Design a binder for this molecule. Structure first.
Ligand SMILES: CCCCCCCCCCCCCCCCCC(=O)OC[C@H](COP(=O)([O-])OCC(O)COP(=O)([O-])OC[C@@H](COC(=O)CCCCCCCCCCCCCCCCC)OC(=O)CCCCCCCCCCCCCCCCC)OC(=O)CCCCCCCCCCCCCCCCC
Ligand SMILES: CCCCCCCCCCCCCCCCCC(=O)OC[C@H](COP(=O)([O-])OCC(O)COP(=O)([O-])OC[C@@H](COC(=O)CCCCCCCCCCCCCCCCC)OC(=O)CCCCCCCCCCCCCCCCC)OC(=O)CCCCCCCCCCCCCCCCC
Ligand SMILES: CCCCCCCCCCCCCCCCCC(=O)OC[C@H](COP(=O)([O-])OCC(O)COP(=O)([O-])OC[C@@H](COC(=O)CCCCCCCCCCCCCCCCC)OC(=O)CCCCCCCCCCCCCCCCC)OC(=O)CCCCCCCCCCCCCCCCC
Ligand SMILES: CCCCCCCCCCCCCCCCCC(=O)OC[C@H](COP(=O)([O-])OCC(O)COP(=O)([O-])OC[C@@H](COC(=O)CCCCCCCCCCCCCCCCC)OC(=O)CCCCCCCCCCCCCCCCC)OC(=O)CCCCCCCCCCCCCCCCC
Ligand code: HEA
Ligand code: HEA
Ligand SMILES: CCCCCCCC/C=C\CCCCCCCC(=O)OC[C@H](COP(=O)(O)OCCN)OC(=O)CCCCCCCCCCCCCCC
Ligand SMILES: CCCCCCCCCCCCCCCC(=O)O
Ligand SMILES: [Ca+2]
Ligand SMILES: [Cu+2]
Ligand SMILES: [Cu+2]
Ligand SMILES: [Cu+2]
Lengths: 551, 52, 285, 185, 139, 143, 65
């Protein structure tokens, strides 16, 4: 027998966190800081989305002007893409990647905190445009060239948008540098490159894509700021200015969407084998598919520029189909992982299945968008809106929640209540499909995107009502998760074991909950890509060797 | 209090043969692990370059 | 058809018909793939669940290289057939016969349109009109912009109505005075970005419909973010008969506004598929 | 020495990202060169190819001296490293002064950022490269101070190595930009 | 470390092939000749991957196998000292605040605020870089 | 011997796992009751500068000997006050160390026994423990 | 319309939340049912310590209920 306490500590004493928040080089605390701040920014973006949907419920302009609605979708898109998704990627990276490779830290612990604070302050700078009397940016998140000049949209909110994006991009580049260096030269003795999990590979390729993409956006933003302040002629339509901005921006922006897609593919590829009681299927195949996606996400940038009539349609359309193939391979590998196993739908596995369904439908919609003749009708319409919301809830919402539910015990030492988790998942699923299934139809029969107001004779009222109802279901779905996290942090069920999910595979389940400072008091003999499984179940090693090949 | 009770964190990490990542602490007093000193209202060093 | 096209309006040009058929086929393929993969997901979730009897971990298999390559190559075939049909259709929708029958100088300015009737040349040889106005074009050298004698300026109170014949080849030359706009007529199943200087930016601002099949009234919208009133920039295309079209052109020749000529040609004077927007910034005004 | 140095690899990957930033600037320059119509550079621009060659040669010489200072710092000689890096700092300062002088002479001759598209792209690209050069000079000063304030450990040698890496990236980018602007035209 | 290098020149090979294909397919069969923005970006993406891969290959040509690059490795092989990791610092937040001051001064075009932000950046970067190298006070 | 999913590690630590959806701690009491007991123990032992401990389980026969045995495996047995409760044998015991002498526990250990009994009559184990620990803590002053 | 659709947006989320909470909250959790003094103490021996202040026995007391 041994002594304990009846319950663990609810909260630390006074002055236990604030100086850590200011001065920590700990990657786990910094990952938690990303998680919390990214979720707050997600709430702000969703509030903007609810305002837009409430306005779009009825054909009249009830409470929003056109200026305000343009501000709202510009800032909603900007916040959701750049202040929630891109930084939550590095939040998850900081949370688990040093644990996954058996490292005591990231390569540059101070550069990590610098990246986080650059995130926070750039996001704040870009959002502070509402404080201006002219309002925040009201030209969309894509910032197309002539509309963004000193003449058209001349306010200060757009300039704050540009510079906040510059600061956040610098932070993202620094974080990517840190992740690449940490992966390259900080692994444990046994951990070979082909023994890191899928998540580590995905963060590595994501960091490569970040290094490729974000400097382009920074240079484009600096040219735009030159044209706005110094009256430069970089993007002037007399030159090839408008197409110059389109090319530069999309060379950034499609790598951006794959940057926010790949790490969550890694998250689900981590979660699936645990709750499947099986190994991840096609480990090497998944590594190569991830590499193929990373390589191909750089030459397809002009499938967003079909309607301009100034690009090579066959080249980009073919490259888009070619990049569509590997994601199909990835779904096949995930299905093979779930196939013929023992599935228990604790909340992360349920969220991963939701990811599968939602992102599959989004990918089908994207393939439809890939054909230039079909994009000639459905571009700039709510069909694009529905497609990219489907892929974005696939990656950065269902898989974000799956990862949060999965790695909450590892980071806090407490469980999240599974009943509130199931309620939250079903609310999210129903609300999301309610609010985004009908927009395919709404865009097919022409309702363009970014319209603040339409006509009663347009014939769009019923589907917009359904969309607004679903949007408010999505709004009320955040209460179960917020309440669950808030109560479970302090009064959550204690975890006194390693791997409270039973069949964890990677090294983060070989240490305690939470891991101590430097993450490891001992390291196991690493011999495959699931070291914790072999450690915790040593009778299964010969099984796994003998039965690894299906044929 | 943390500095007084564990000693200054030197920023140096060692991997022990069994896999333990430990940080090298420099005690400000004698060791038995250091004997925890008593706070005396004075500033404490927290970087090793400041101790020479 | 009606439900399987997921809402695309029935085409009114041969290019629109072909595009709609390609969309129907592509939606069939996409929904078939989705049905297959979702059936796999539901078969795995419903069955293959950890039972009360299940005592030992399952077969720890993770590599099935043959099936991996089979399902690697199947999507390549699907995207190959899609690419072939795509290139065929997108080349058909950009044919550009060197002799148009009606030419329109579409000009988009800050939240309205302006049509030109640059050069009408009927194929039967019954009507030839040369509306190009080069003195106005040279008066401001925006050389890229095009002017014409007969115009239809959209206003805050009047929706600009384009009048065209049926069965006659129509060419649109797109120009924008200020910023990028969008020329979309949801019935053509086709839209194009209206750029400031389409030539200096290497863009093809010209596109043709071989023939508008049936006459009527059709709404058009701006489909490119352009600023405050982006949602309040609609226009209308009123396809009429060739003889009615010639009569309308002749009335417009003798100093007649659009509404007056439309009334003269036994048609509604104003837009009927869209209405002008209330200038009031909201209902709380 | 049986492991790689991570400060070096981090510097290398970040330098590659900075190369991508200058890729964006190069894409800005190449466009509007094809829109001018062959009159490139247009009047009243007349590139002073008599001061641009000397500053290019001084930058190459500074790269050579910086590598020599790396050689000095690899054997633990802090004083030789200090000497070579002070020489490199002075010659990079001379390069910046020459760039500013050419800027002044060009602006005096009706070539400005708002004046023309060629001016816009030329001053944008060259000024951003000059900002990177000034950042390198600040890095040199900070490194020399740090070598002054502690015993010359291998960590100091690593810092000097990565500062030289940045300097080499800078002057290679300048070689490319000079070849693109004053030769291809 | 052969794997990391090899991944980087695989990316380099694909990027070079794509860049050359784009340049050729835009020189002929495009509206206005070579596109000059996708081509430039693709060529310099090739350059980015080339630099990283070349440096890693020069490192792998000059390295005996590490524990982590060696299969059948035992934890005891990796035993010893790793290096210096900063235990704590409040300089990153100051650097970020300085860069944010500069960014606000250049968003709202205020040259004085730009200069103040730049000076603050130099000061906070000096503080970060000098943090573990300042000696004991002389007195 | 190690449970299923448990393994010995190179540093002596026992790395164990729990079933998905299963709990590592499964005390047969409400969570908030455990929180209240933790607060009672920690704040009472903070005020009295003596470690209060609660033991629940079998005492067999000769309960005094069993409780005095259990006391010695508290982290600081000398400054420790352990209250043992055996519901199968319905026995309440208080045992305290040598350094807890003449501080105030002499008259307060029977007080804690009486409080725990007057709460156990109704049939509340945790609540009786709370009352006993509160009373015993309030009955002891620091060294 | 304004009477109705506002009611839809206000109330459909609320009724969906209500029904899903009835389904998913009132369910049995994994926390074990609280012990009853009537039943035998089958749980393993429990030793809790306050662990706030960071062998020989010199006192004691006894009693019963
Ligand atoms: C706005 C602020 C409002 C909240 C603060 C008010 C509550 C409070 O008590 O404040 C004290 C609290 C800590 O005070 P303390 O005295 O140092 O510690 C005593 C506590 O008991 C702390 O004791 P502890 O150490 O045991 O606490 C443990 C745990 C305690 O945490 C909890 O108990 C629950 C936390 C979650 C609540 C619900 C979150 C909902 C989001 C869901 C998403 C979660 C995903 C999960 C992911 C993880 C698993 C993968 O905290 C953690 O370990 C993780 C930290 C959580 C995030 C920390 C803050 C992130 C952002 C950092 C600052 C960015 C803004 C700076 C503004 C500009 C700067 C100039 O915070 C502060 O002192 C900051 C002052 C707040 C004023 C506003 C900021 C000034 C400008
Ligand atoms: C664009 C923004 C440029 C930011 C450049 C930062 C990228 C560098 C990332 C890879 C470096 C790896 C590293 O560990 O950095 C050390 C350190 C990270 O600290 P840690 O986590 O403890 O890493 C542990 C290392 O083992 C500890 O390594 P260590 O102590 O041996 O550090 C060696 C070396 C490491 O530093 C380098 O890698 C050399 C790279 C020089 C970059 C020059 C910037 C050019 C400005 C472009 C703007 C146009 O640092 C030095 O000894 C001297 C160089 C530091 C001066 C930085 C230049 C001042 C910036 C002011 C620019 C204003 C001029 C425009 C007006 O990061 C820095 O010192 C630079 C931070 C710059 C803040 C961004 C401000 C915006
Ligand atoms: C929206 C607003 C955002 C809200 C959040 C923003 C707050 C930012 C937090 C600043 C972090 C500074 C800090 O925590 O110092 C802790 C500092 C160190 O305590 P310790 O390390 O535990 O004990 C020392 C050891 O015993 C003895 O060992 P030791 O050697 O480590 O101690 C000496 C060590 C540290 O000893 C110190 O106490 C240094 C205190 C530095 C003051 C920094 C304030 C500026 O070295 C020094 O003395 C450094 C002297 C150099 C100072 C001059 C350099 C100027 C700063 C860089 C210029 C860039 C400014 C950014 C521009 C922003 C424009 C908006 O103690 C303090 O708490 C001092 C008060 C903290 C400053 C509060 C200022 C409030 C500002 C309101 C919001 C803005
Ligand atoms: C536009 C408006 C904004 C612009 C700024 C406004 C004007 C700025 C006023 C600056 C005046 C400061 C004092 C001038 C007198 C010079 C003092 C001196 O020579 O002794 C060296 C002095 C150390 O003397 P110490 O008494 O032996 O230090 C005792 C501990 O060992 C020290 O150990 P510790 O760890 O506690 O010290 C921490 C701290 C060391 O600094 C301090 O502790 C004193 C606080 C001054 C920090 C700089 C704040 C200025 C901006 C805010 O480390 C830093 O923060 C590095 C900051 C260096 C920035 C220099 C670049 C600025 C150029 C801008 C272009 O070094 C410095 O504090 C900074 C030197 C920078 C002054 C430039 C001219 C002197 C160059 C020295 C060459 C040898
Ligand atoms: C999560 C981020 C993310 C991801 C991963 C994707 C992935 C894809 N996207 Fe897109 N996309 C966006 C985010 C993303 N996208 C955003 C934000 C916009 C709008 C930006 C704006 O304008 O504001 C956009 C817009 C956009 C456009 C431009 C439309 C326009 O601007 O008007 C196109 C064109 O091709 C496109 C297509 C695709 C395709 C083919 C994929 C492929 O990667 C999908 C791959 C998936 C599958 C292919 C399904 C799974 C495969 C199988 C089951 C095998 C069998 C399947 C077949 C044989 C088809 N999406
Ligand atoms: C990460 C990707 C992402 C996410 C998560 C979202 C989130 C949502 N989005 Fe959005 N969206 C985009 C990507 C995304 N979006 C992009 C790229 C654009 C383009 C913008 C542009 O063109 O510039 C866009 C814009 C956009 C449009 C196009 C509008 C138009 O063009 O006319 C629509 C259409 O319905 C929409 C709807 C929604 C809804 C209902 C949610 C819901 O998921 C939101 C759910 C969250 C909530 C509802 C929060 C609930 C609020 C509270 C609980 C109150 C508490 C808040 C505080 C205390 C501050 N958003
Ligand atoms: C930003 C991009 C920066 C590029 C640097 C190039 C600087 C090179 C200088 C170019 C010289 C020139 O072109 O001067 C002629 C014109 C005058 O026009 P004028 O009236 O006709 O002539 C005069 C007749 N009296 O300068 C101008 O417009 C003013 C140009 C001033 C440049 C200011 C530099 C900005 C610094 C950016 C810092 C970024 C910080 C942000 C952090 C995220
Ligand atoms: C142009 C930028 C200027 C940056 C200023 C950096 C040098 C100032 C502080 C360095 C102090 C060096 C001496 C340390 C003490 C010993 O000697
Ligand atoms: Ca409305
Ligand atoms: Cu895309
Ligand atoms: Cu578009
Ligand atoms: Cu418009």
């Amino acid at each position: 027998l041994e002594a304990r306490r009846p319950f663990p500590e609810r909260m630390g004493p006074k002055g236990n966190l604030i100086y850590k928040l200011i001065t920590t080089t700990d990657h786990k605390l910094i990952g938690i800081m990303y998680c919390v701040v990214c979720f707050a920014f997600f709430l702000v973006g969703g509030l903007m989305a609810l305002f837009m949907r409430t306005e779009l419920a009825m054909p009249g302009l009830q409470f929003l002007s056109n200026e305000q609605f343009n501000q709202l979708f510009t800032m909603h898109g900007t916040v959701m893409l750049l202040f929630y998704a891109t930084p939550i990627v590095f939040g998850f990276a900081n949370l688990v990647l040093p644990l996954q490779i058996g490292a005591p830290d990231v390569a540059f612990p101070r550069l990590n905190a610098l990246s986080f604070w650059l995130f926070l302050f750039g996001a704040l700078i870009a959002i502070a445009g509402f404080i201006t009397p002219g309002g925040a940016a009201d030209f969309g998140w894509t910032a197309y060239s002539p509309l963004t000049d000193a003449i058209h949209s001349p306010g200060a909110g757009g300039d704050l948008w540009i510079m906040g994006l510059a600061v956040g991009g610098l932070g993202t580049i620094l974080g990517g540098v840190n992740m690449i260096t940490t992966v390259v030269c900080m692994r444990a003795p046994g951990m070979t490159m082909f023994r890191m999990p899928i998540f580590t590979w995905n963060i590595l390729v994501t960091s490569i894509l970040v290094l490729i993409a974000f400097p382009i956006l920074t240079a484009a933003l600096f040219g735009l700021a030159a044209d706005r302040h110094l009256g430069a002629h970089i993007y002037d339509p007399a030159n090839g200015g408008v197409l110059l901005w389109q090319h530069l921006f999309w060379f950034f922006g499609h790598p951006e969407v794959y940057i926010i897609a790949l790490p969550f593919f890694g998250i689900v590829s981590e979660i699936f084998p645990v709750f499947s009681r099986k190994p991840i299927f096609g480990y090497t195949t998944l590594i190569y598919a991830t590499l193929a996606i990373a390589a191909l996400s750089v030459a397809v940038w002009a499938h967003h520029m079909y309607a301009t009539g100034a690009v090579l349609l066959p080249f980009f359309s073919f490259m888009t189909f070619l990049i569509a193939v590997p994601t199909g391979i990835k779904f096949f590998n995930w299905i093979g992982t779930m196939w013929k196993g023992q599935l228990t739908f604790e909340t992360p596995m349920l969220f991963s299945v939701g990811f599968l369904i939602t992102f599959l439908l989004g990918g089908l919609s994207g393939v439809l968008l890939a054909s230039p003749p079909l994009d000639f009708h459905v571009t700039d319409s709510y069909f694009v809106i529905a497609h990219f919301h489907y892929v974005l809830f696939g990656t950065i919402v269902f898989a974000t929640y799956a990862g949060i539910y999965f790695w909450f015990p590892k980071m806090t030492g407490r469980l999240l209540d599974e009943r509130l988790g199931k309620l939250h998942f079903w609310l999210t699923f129903i609300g999301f499909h309610t609010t985004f299934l009908v927009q395919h139809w709404l865009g097919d029969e022409g309702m363009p995107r970014r319209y603040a107001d339409y006509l009663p004779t347009d014939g769009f009222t019923t589907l917009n009502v359904i969309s607004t109802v679903g949007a408010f279901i999505l709004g009320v779905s955040m209460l179960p998760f917020v309440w669950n996290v808030f109560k479970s942090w302090r009064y959550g069920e204690p975890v006194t074991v390693d791997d409270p999910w039973g069949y964890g595979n990677s090294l983060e389940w070989a240490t305690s909950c939470p891991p101590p400072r430097h993450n490891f008091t001992e390291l196991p003999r690493i011999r495959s890509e699931r070291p914790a499984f072999e450690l915790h179940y040593p009778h299964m090693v010969e099984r796994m060797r003998a039965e690894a090949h299906v044929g | 209090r943390e500095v007084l009770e564990h000693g200054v964190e030197t920023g140096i990490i060692k991997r022990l043969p069994h896999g333990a990542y430990v940080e090298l602490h420099q005690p400000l007093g004698p060791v038995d692990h250091p004997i925890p000193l008593e706070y005396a209202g004075a500033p404490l060093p927290k970087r090793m370059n400041k101790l020479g | 058809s009606d439900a399987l096209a997921l809402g695309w309006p029935t085409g009114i040009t041969p290019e629109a018909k072909l595009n709609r058929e390609l969309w129907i086929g592509s939606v069939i393929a996409s929904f078939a793939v989705g049905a297959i993969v979702w059936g796999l997901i539901f078969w795995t979730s419903a069955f293959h669940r950890k039972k009360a009897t299940d005592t030992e971990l399952p077969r720890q298999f993770g590599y099935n290289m043959p099936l991996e390559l089979t399902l690697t190559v199947i999507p390549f075939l699907i995207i190959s057939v899609l690419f072939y049909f795509t290139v065929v259709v997108q080349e058909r929708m950009m044919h550009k016969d060197p002799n148009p029958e009606v030419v329109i100088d579409v000009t988009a300015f800050q939240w309205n349109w302006k049509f030109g009737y640059q050069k009408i040349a009927f194929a039967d040889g019954s009507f030839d009109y040369d509306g190009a106005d080069p003195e106005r074009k040279e008066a401001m050298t925006r050389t890229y912009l095009n002017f014409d004698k007969i115009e239809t300026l959209g206003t805050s109170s009047e929706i600009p109505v384009l009048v065209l014949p049926a069965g006659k080849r129509i060419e649109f030359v797109l120009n924008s005075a200020d910023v990028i706009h969008g020329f979309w007529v949801p019935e053509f199943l086709f839209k194009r970005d209206v750029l400031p200087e389409p030539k200096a930016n290497n863009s093809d601002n010209v596109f043709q419909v071989s023939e508008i099949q049936q006459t009527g009234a059709f709404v058009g919208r701006c489909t490119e973010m352009c600023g405050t009133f982006h949602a309040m920039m609609n226009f209308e295309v009123r396809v009429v008969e060739p003889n009615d079209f010639k009569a309308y052109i002749d009335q417009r020749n003798a100093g007649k506004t659009n509404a007056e000529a439309l009334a003269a040609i036994n048609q509604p004077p104003l837009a009927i598929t869209t209405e002008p927007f209330e200038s009031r910034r909201g209902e709380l005004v | 020495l049986n492991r790689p140095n991570m400060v070096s690899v981090g510097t290398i990957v970040w330098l590659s990202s900075e190369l991508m930033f200058f890729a964006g600037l190069f894409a800005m320059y190449f466009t509007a060169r094809a829109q001018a119509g062959g009159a490139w550079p247009p009047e009243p621009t007349e590139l002073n190819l008599a001061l641009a060659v000397p500053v290019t040669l001084v930058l190459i010489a500074s790269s050579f001296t910086c590598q020599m200072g790396v050689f000095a710092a690899e054997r633990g000689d802090v004083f030789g490293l200090r000497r070579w890096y002070v020489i490199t700092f002075l010659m990079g300062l001379f390069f910046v002064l020459g760039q500013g002088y050419e800027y002044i002479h060009l602006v005096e001759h009706g070539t400005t950022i708002p004046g023309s598209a060629y001016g816009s792209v030329f001053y944008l690209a060259t000024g951003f490269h000059g900002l990177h050069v000034i950042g390198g000079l600040v890095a040199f000063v900070l490194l020399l101070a740090r070598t002054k304030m502690s015993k010359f450990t291998p960590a100091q040698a690593t810092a000097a190595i990565v500062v030289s890496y940045y300097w080499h990236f800078v002057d290679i980018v300048w070689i490319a930009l000079f070849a693109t602007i004053y030769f291809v035209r | 470390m052969h794997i990391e290098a090899r991944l980087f020149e695989i990316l380099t090979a694909f990027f070079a092939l794509a860049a050359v294909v784009y340049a050729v397919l835009t020189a002929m069969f495009a509206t206005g000749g070579v596109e000059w923005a996708g081509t430039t970006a693709l060529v310099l993406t090739t350059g980015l991957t080339l630099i990283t891969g070349t440096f890693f290959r020069f490192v792998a040509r000059r390295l005996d196998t590490r524990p982590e690059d060696y299969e059948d490795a035992e934890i005891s092989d990796g035993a010893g000292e790793l290096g210096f990791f900063a235990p704590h610092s409040w300089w990153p937040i100051l650097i970020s605040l300085s860069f944010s001051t500069a960014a606000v001064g250049a968003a709202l075009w205020l040259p004085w605020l730009i200069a103040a932000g730049v000076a603050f950046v130099i000061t906070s970067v000096c503080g970060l870089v000098f943090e573990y190298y300042w000696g004991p006070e002389k007195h | 011997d190690l449970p299923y999913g448990s393994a010995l590690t190179s540093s002596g630590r026992i790395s164990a796992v729990t079933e998905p959806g299963e709990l590592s701690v499964h005390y047969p009491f409400p969570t908030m009751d455990l929180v209240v007991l933790d607060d009672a123990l920690k704040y009472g032992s903070r005020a009295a500068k003596a470690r209060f401990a609660v033991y629940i389980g079998p005492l067999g026969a000769d309960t005094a000997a069993t409780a005095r045995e259990i006391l010695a495996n508290v982290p600081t047995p000398e400054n420790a006050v352990l209250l043992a409760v055996s519901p199968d044998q319905r026995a309440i015991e208080v045992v305290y160390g040598a350094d807890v002498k003449g501080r105030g526990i002499e008259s307060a250990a029977p007080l804690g026994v009486s409080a725990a009994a007057a709460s156990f009559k109704e049939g509340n184990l945790i609540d009786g423990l709370i009352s006993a620990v509160r009373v015993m803590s309030a009955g002891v002053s620091p060294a | 319309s304004t009477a109705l659709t506002h009611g839809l947006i206000g109330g459909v989320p609320l009724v969906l939340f209500a029904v899903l909470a009835l389904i998913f909250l009132t369910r049995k959790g994994p926390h074990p049912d609280t012990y009853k003094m009537s039943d035998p103490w089958t749980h393993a021996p429990i030793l809790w310590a306050a662990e706030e202040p960071r062998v020989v026995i010199g006192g004691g007391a006894s009693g019963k209920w």
